[PDB]
Design a protein around this nucleic acid. Structure first.
Ligand SMILES: [K+]
Ligand SMILES: [K+]
Ligand SMILES: [K+]
Ligand SMILES: [K+]
Ligand SMILES: [K+]
Ligand SMILES: [K+]
Ligand SMILES: [K+]
Ligand SMILES: [Mg+2]
Ligand SMILES: [Mg+2]
Ligand SMILES: [Mg+2]
Ligand SMILES: [Mg+2]
Ligand SMILES: [Mg+2]
Ligand SMILES: [Mg+2]
Ligand SMILES: [Mg+2]
Ligand SMILES: [Mg+2]
Ligand SMILES: [Mg+2]
Ligand SMILES: [Mg+2]
Ligand SMILES: [Mg+2]
Ligand SMILES: [Mg+2]
Ligand SMILES: [Mg+2]
Ligand SMILES: [Mg+2]
Ligand SMILES: [Mg+2]
Ligand SMILES: [Mg+2]
Ligand SMILES: [Mg+2]
Ligand SMILES: [Mg+2]
Ligand SMILES: [Mg+2]
Ligand SMILES: [Mg+2]
Ligand SMILES: [Mg+2]
Ligand SMILES: [Mg+2]
Ligand SMILES: [Mg+2]
Ligand SMILES: [Mg+2]
Ligand SMILES: [Mg+2]
Ligand SMILES: [Mg+2]
Ligand SMILES: [Mg+2]
Ligand SMILES: [Mg+2]
Lengths: 97, 95
RNA sequence: GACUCGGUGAAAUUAUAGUACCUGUGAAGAUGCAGGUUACCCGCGACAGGACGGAAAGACCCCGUGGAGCUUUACUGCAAC
RNA sequence: GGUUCGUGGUAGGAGAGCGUUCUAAGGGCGGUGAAGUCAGACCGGAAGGACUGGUGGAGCGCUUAGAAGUGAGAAUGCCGGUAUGAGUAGCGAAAGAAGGGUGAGAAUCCCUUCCACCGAAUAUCUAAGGUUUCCUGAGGAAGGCUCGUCCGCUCAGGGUU
RNA sequence: GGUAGCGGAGAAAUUCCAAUCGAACUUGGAGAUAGCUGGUUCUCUCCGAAAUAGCUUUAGGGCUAGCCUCGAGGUAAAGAG
RNA sequence: GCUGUACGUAAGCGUUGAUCCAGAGAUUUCCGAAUGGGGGAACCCACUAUCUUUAGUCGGAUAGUAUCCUUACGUGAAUACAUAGCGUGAGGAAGGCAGACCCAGGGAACUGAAACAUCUAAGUACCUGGAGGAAGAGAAAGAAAAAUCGAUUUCCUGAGUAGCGGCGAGCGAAACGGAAAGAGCCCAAACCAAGAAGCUUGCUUCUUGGGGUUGUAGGACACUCUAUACGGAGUUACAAAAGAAAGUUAUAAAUGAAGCGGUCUGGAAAGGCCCGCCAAAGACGGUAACAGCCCGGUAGUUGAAAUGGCUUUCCCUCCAGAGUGGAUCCUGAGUACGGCGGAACACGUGAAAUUCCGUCGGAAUCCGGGAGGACCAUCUCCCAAGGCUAAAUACUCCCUAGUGACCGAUAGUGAACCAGUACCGUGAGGGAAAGGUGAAAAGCACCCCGGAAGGGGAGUGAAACAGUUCCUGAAACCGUGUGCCUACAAGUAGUUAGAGCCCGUUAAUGGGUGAUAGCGUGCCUUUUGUAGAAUGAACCGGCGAGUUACGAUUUGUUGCAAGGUUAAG
């Protein structure tokens, strides 16, 4: 309240809409994936069992924030281009679930 | 009441401690006993239809039952009491 | 009635009070401050200038995005026709 | 423990504490006298805390923590008590007097006599209403605007065919 | 005996409806709401304002800023004379 | 031992077993729904039957007699059969509360939006009706989505999200998920049988029995196999009403260890000191003061004639269920939907799905029908218009046992006391105040003043400065007495200097008083500013104002740390 002066929110406009089929994905980085011995297989179930993840919100997504040092096969719902590149460059491989 | 009219009695506590006497009355509505020679007390009595002479009278007053202990009429010494059944008649027992 | 005697015995009020006057100052109208002037202590009956006296959170005035009652071609409605 | 600069303060911010009620634990005093209360010329920088003595006559402190119905001088505050005015206003329309008597006590009660008041009423009946206030015998705490030996007051017995 | 409150009665005055009537009394919603007044209880120590701008169906209210306090920061020490 | 609180005197009963306690019975005036009729509450007046008294009237007992609903039966009109109506009998209800919880009908405003009307407050308060111990809801015409789940309810979350909204103030879910608790069933209809009513006249159309109840559709109807009590189920739904027995529990009770230990204080010992003891018992309370060992009792162990409940057993009662076909037939009609008008769903007509009410219209009915937030198609899920259903949930006038960092008599219930009283009011209705002798009445014999009250002694008691508002007994307030000052003086009343006089202390550069001298316009509030001729307070005492729940944010602390933490349960 501002004394009958028009409030800030009433002097500016509404914006947008909430989508109903919105998909938000659990965000995994590369730094975590150094925890595993090379040549093994990473999965959603494994990442939950290890407590890295609790909520598979609408899926998993692996982002290239950081670095890996280790060869790995990874499988998830969506990857970023850069993280795919880094995984391959370490000799890893990628599957899309 | 563990003490009854007609009993012989020892006094545990009080100013009249160590003394003994008979039980002349009992009041279980108040847990008091009226005992001879114990708690004698001076009543300032105006004359009336009885005690028409009036005066200061020494008479016994009641004292509490817990201040009192029973005596076995055979030993003559004071005894805490239990209860047993003789035949089909409950009784009082010394111990 | 009031006044004195005898009996009985309230009230409104009340910050504490050993409660003068003039002139002045001061929230601009002082029993209470200043400076001067008067004034031994305690009461009784009478008067009412002041205590901006008592009573009644001014009824005048203004304010409140307070209220009630009334009016109408104010607005929106309702019954009834 | 030192040096330098400071140390008026409303609204208001910040901090450190005093004290009350209760709880837990530890450790205590207290019928050879607790809390409380009364008086004191003691203590601490403050809120406040001890000591002594009297009264009281059975419970209460201290320590460290914790929790709060937490500390009043004002609200034309609320309830209770007591003042002030103040021995004041008032004692509620009216004619009483004296003698005898009762009685601890009499303007006030009872009796007598004179006097005075109402008299289309201040009389006699009776509804409504009130509900024992009627009668008798005792009584005088309170009530009665004084008084009281009296009462429509208090007690106890009766009384309405 | 009848008429009862969004009502009734009025030879009509806002008159009367149990000492209340421009809309009874009581109980409840109800601790109505009150930008209004009043009040708000112990101590010390440090610091210490404002009564301005702007906007406001706003003017004795409020909001933001200016002014106070407390804490933490950061340095190419920026403040003051 | 007893004849209550409740003293008293009188008179009496009790071990040939009282008073008392528990269970079941009996009796239970009059009023009140109040019911034989009336009625101004607790009053009045009756009738019909049988009996009784009187010489007979008069009078007395006992039983029945309300209204409505349903049901039979009998009478019975206009009107002719008949129905209405009337009467009788068998059942049933009526009314009250616990100011609580829930279901429906009806339904505000104050307030908030810093006006206000949509909106909010709020489907709240209130009225009314129905109830029941819970109610309501409920066994998918569901929730959902590349995967399915399997009745309802309640809780945690989702989430203050999605969204609604003068898109303002504000209103605000649901599902998934996780838990408590768990349970599933019955009709209708086709179809068979009987009966009656129409003769719908060889067809219906109503009352009962069987049959059957559902979605990959199920059933009737055809067959096979079983089945007639083999076995199973049950009064908590699935049908309903009874009975016994056993055990357990509740409503009375019983038994129950150990110090009269010594000594000190003391009015009194339960306390101090020194010795012991018991403990499945050191709960509580009482007792002349603080008791495990004094009393009642507690732990423990026992027990109930009678009645009530629960759990089991028996009796009793009652019980066709699988399969394959699928000619045909059935599957909730004036509903389901739609229009109009309103409402409930978080959803304010908004694009407005879903549910409900009123009124208009008005389907298909299995190659059918609904929903998936307008709507269309496809897909998926599901069968409405009929009914029942425990448990988990909500509340507490009550009973039993118990608890409190709850009150402790201006508190705590309004009410610790004869309080919903006194009192106020015509009434509805409002509504107080008021606790404490003592361990024990031992409650002051007797004397004196006095008419009494009240005192002073005496005496009781530890104590009467504990004496019938009686533990303690503050302050305002009223007084008695006295050490110092005061009748030439004004002064917010004190302070500072200070003589003289008087005392002697928590002993310290002390106390009380103050001639006289200097200075000095209360407190609070609100104000630019108040001694203020502005406000408030008579005084004294008590009570009397930032708190709690949930959430946001920040600071500090602690723990773990790219981890941390669990909620319900
Ligand atoms: K005057
Ligand atoms: K003392
Ligand atoms: K009235
Ligand atoms: K039900
Ligand atoms: K005890
Ligand atoms: K709609
Ligand atoms: K569905
Ligand atoms: Mg504006
Ligand atoms: Mg005069
Ligand atoms: Mg005014
Ligand atoms: Mg300062
Ligand atoms: Mg308080
Ligand atoms: Mg005068
Ligand atoms: Mg006079
Ligand atoms: Mg005349
Ligand atoms: Mg008389
Ligand atoms: Mg008198
Ligand atoms: Mg006029
Ligand atoms: Mg309200
Ligand atoms: Mg109010
Ligand atoms: Mg300063
Ligand atoms: Mg408003
Ligand atoms: Mg004592
Ligand atoms: Mg539809
Ligand atoms: Mg519509
Ligand atoms: Mg709505
Ligand atoms: Mg319709
Ligand atoms: Mg859709
Ligand atoms: Mg008291
Ligand atoms: Mg009270
Ligand atoms: Mg006293
Ligand atoms: Mg002189
Ligand atoms: Mg003045
Ligand atoms: Mg005043
Ligand atoms: Mg006061």
């Amino acid at each position: 309240f501002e004394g009958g002066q028009l409030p800030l929110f009433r002097r500016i406009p509404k914006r947008g809409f909430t989508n109903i089929n919105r998909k938000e994905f659990a965000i995994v980085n590369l730094d975590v994936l150094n925890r595993f011995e090379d040549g093994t297989e990473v999965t959603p179930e494994l990442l939950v069992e290890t407590g890295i993840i609790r909520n598979e919100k609408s899926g998993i997504k692996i982002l290239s924030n950081g670095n890996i040092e280790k060869k790995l096969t990874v499988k998830a719902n969506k990857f970023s281009a850069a993280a795919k590149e880094a995984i391959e460059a370490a000799g890893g491989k990628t599957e899309v679930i | 009441m563990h003490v009854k009219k007609g009993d012989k009695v020892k006094v545990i506590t009080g100013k009249d401690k160590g003394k003994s006497g008979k039980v002349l009355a009992a009041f279980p509505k108040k847990d008091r006993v009226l005992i001879e020679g114990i708690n004698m007390v001076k009543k300032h009595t105006k004359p009336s239809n009885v005690n028409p002479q009036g005066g200061i009278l020494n008479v016994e007053a009641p004292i509490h039952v817990s201040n009192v202990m029973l005596i076995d009429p055979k030993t003559g010494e004071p005894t805490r009491v239990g209860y047993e059944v003789k035949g089909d008649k409950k009784v009082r027992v010394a111990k």
